[PDB]
């Protein structure tokens, strides 16, 4: 079995959607709240 005549050449899914959201937005959002209290 397992031929494919070659002409040319959970644990994982939920976090991938969560990797999509905070991909480049506030990863370690931990200390800006300490710096937003005196601004806002």
């Amino acid at each position: 079995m397992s031929e494919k005549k070659q002409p040319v050449d959970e644990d994982n899914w939920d976090d991938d959607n969560v990797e999509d959201d905070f991909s480049n937005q506030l990863r370690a959002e931990l200390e800006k709240h300490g710096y937003k209290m005196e601004t806002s």
Partner: protein, 508 residues
């Protein structure tokens, strides 16, 4: 010589063990059961030939010292193979050339000696009329020449061996192809040699007079026989017609040979793929994704699958062109993971609304996308990013200034920020109005789509389809009804004993 005479002498006979059992069983069968009685629509020699293609791909590697394949040719090429009383001496010749390797030294076929291994079909009453033998006795040397491909002043030994096979091929094209499956069994041998006829020519030769030779090869198809000649001669017609700009795509629309209706589940499965890229490359989006998906799920159980590495890339290129996107790494492998990471990072930007994030991809991995040959599709995704963005913004914000959306989409201009929204209503992404005098874009809260016809269309596509698979689970189910041998009523003897017992009671 001790390192020689202990490591070299078992590579002759243990292949000679298995080469008296795989193609000798084919040669003992496909001479007497293809030119012989029959090998019908349920044949075995075709799948046996598949087994003698896939085995010898990774079987041979070495340049064959100790004549371990170099002595197979002066063995296997001196074959009359006419009839059993003349092959009963040839069965000894499968053993008589073994001592030629063993007692003496043979002619070591090392890059030069293939010329005295090809001129034999005159030697000892050999023929070409038995082309189930001779077309296999073409292919049985025609494979391991081009299986290593070895590309060092060898190409003419491949070519002269192909010309001799072309001499069998033209006799297949002209002389007595009726009902012996001489076309049918050798259409595979046509198709299987074409991939070696291609990769030689896709290395150092031309491409295009074979095309006109392939048209006459296609011309003689479908008139005389109508199975597996309509199929392989069109995928092998497409293989560089896609990779050229020649017309060849509206031709395949008006090609009647779109359906050969059965193509052995592996040439059929990629057939929908080669025409799947055709509708993709000429802007037919929604029709293409269903024949991309059907091209993915009719495929076998192999692991080194680099064309499946290509369709799994291409299948959801065109769905990024439409909007839907599945989790692509849902079958991620140690060989699939490195082939996804640039392309998976591409659809990371599409599901976001950023604009130069696409450009952060298109310089970081612009060179990789041409290596896969997909760049002309990638460049037009800027229209789809901004229509994804304007749907995201209009669904998030209700009353947003048009001089705010441009700074969020880094458009650098509010004067065309009206203008994308103009085609966004022309295309019909968002519905509601724009106060151009003020600057805010209001939107109506459109809820309760539940009282609209449109979820029934999501039903009616899927109601009728699930009734089809219930039909197919009936239409593919009534074949094992067989050998229902005899519904016995009750008996002959016990029926008569029942009659005698009844007559006893009536007398009583």
């Amino acid at each position: 010589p001790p390192g020689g005479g202990e490591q070299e002498p078992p590579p002759p006979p243990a292949p000679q063990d298995v080469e008296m059992k795989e193609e000798a069983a084919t040669g003992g069968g496909s001479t007497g059961e293809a030119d012989g009685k029959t090998a019908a629509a349920a044949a075995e020699h075709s799948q046996r030939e598949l087994d003698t293609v896939t085995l010898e791909d990774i079987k041979e590697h070495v340049k064959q010292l100790e004549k371990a394949v170099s002595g197979k040719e002066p063995r296997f090429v001196l074959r009359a193979l006419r009839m059993l009383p003349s092959t009963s001496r040839r069965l000894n010749h499968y053993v008589l050339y073994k001592a030629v390797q063993g007692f003496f030294t043979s002619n070591n076929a090392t890059r030069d000696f293939l010329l005295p291994f090809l001129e034999e079909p005159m030697d000892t009453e050999a023929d070409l009329q038995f082309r189930p033998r001779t077309g296999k006795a073409a292919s049985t040397p025609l494979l391991p020449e081009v299986e290593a491909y070895l590309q060092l002043l060898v190409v003419i030994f491949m070519m002269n061996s192909k010309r001799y096979k072309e001499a069998q091929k033209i006799s297949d094209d002209l002389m007595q192809k009726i009902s012996t499956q001489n076309r049918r069994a050798l259409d595979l041998v046509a198709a299987k040699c074409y991939y070696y006829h291609a990769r030689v020519y896709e290395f150092l030769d031309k491409l295009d007079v074979v095309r006109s030779f392939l048209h006459a090869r296609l011309r003689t198809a479908t008139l005389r026989h109508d199975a597996d000649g309509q199929a392989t001669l069109l995928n092998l017609l497409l293989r560089n017609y896609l990779h050229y700009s020649l017309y060849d795509q509206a031709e395949k629309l008006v090609s009647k040979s779109v359906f050969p209706e059965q193509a052995n589940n592996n040439e059929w499965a990629r057939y929908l793929y080669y025409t799947g890229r055709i509708k993709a490359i000429q802007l037919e989006y929604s029709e293409a994704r269903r024949t991309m998906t059907n091209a993915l799920r009719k495929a076998p159980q192999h692991t080194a699958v680099g064309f499946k590495q290509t369709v799994h890339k291409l299948l959801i290129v065109v769905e990024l062109l439409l909007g839907e996107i599945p989790d692509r790494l849902q079958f991620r492998q140690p060989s699939l993971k490195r082939s996804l990471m640039p392309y998976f990072l591409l659809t990371q930007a599409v599901r976001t609304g950023n604009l130069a994030k696409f450009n952060q991809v298109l310089d970081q991995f612009g060179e990789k996308f041409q290596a896969d040959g997909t760049y002309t599709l990638i460049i037009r995704l800027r229209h789809n990013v901004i229509k994804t963005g304007v749907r995201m913004i209009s669904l998030s914000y209700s009353r947003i200034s048009l001089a705010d959306i441009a700074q969020k989409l880094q458009l650098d201009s509010p004067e065309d920020a009206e203008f994308i929204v103009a085609k966004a209503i022309r295309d019909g992404v968002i519905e509601a109005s724009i106060n151009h005098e003020k600057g805010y874009v209001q939107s109506k809260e459109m809820i309760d789509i539940y009282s609209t016809r449109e979820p029934q269309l999501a039903f009616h596509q899927r109601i009728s389809f699930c009734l089809d698979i219930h039909n197919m689970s009936v239409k593919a189910m009534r074949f094992p009804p067989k050998s229902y041998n005899k519904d016995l009523e009750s008996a002959e003897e016990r029926r008569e004993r029942e009659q005698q017992d009844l007559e006893f009671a009536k007398e009583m």
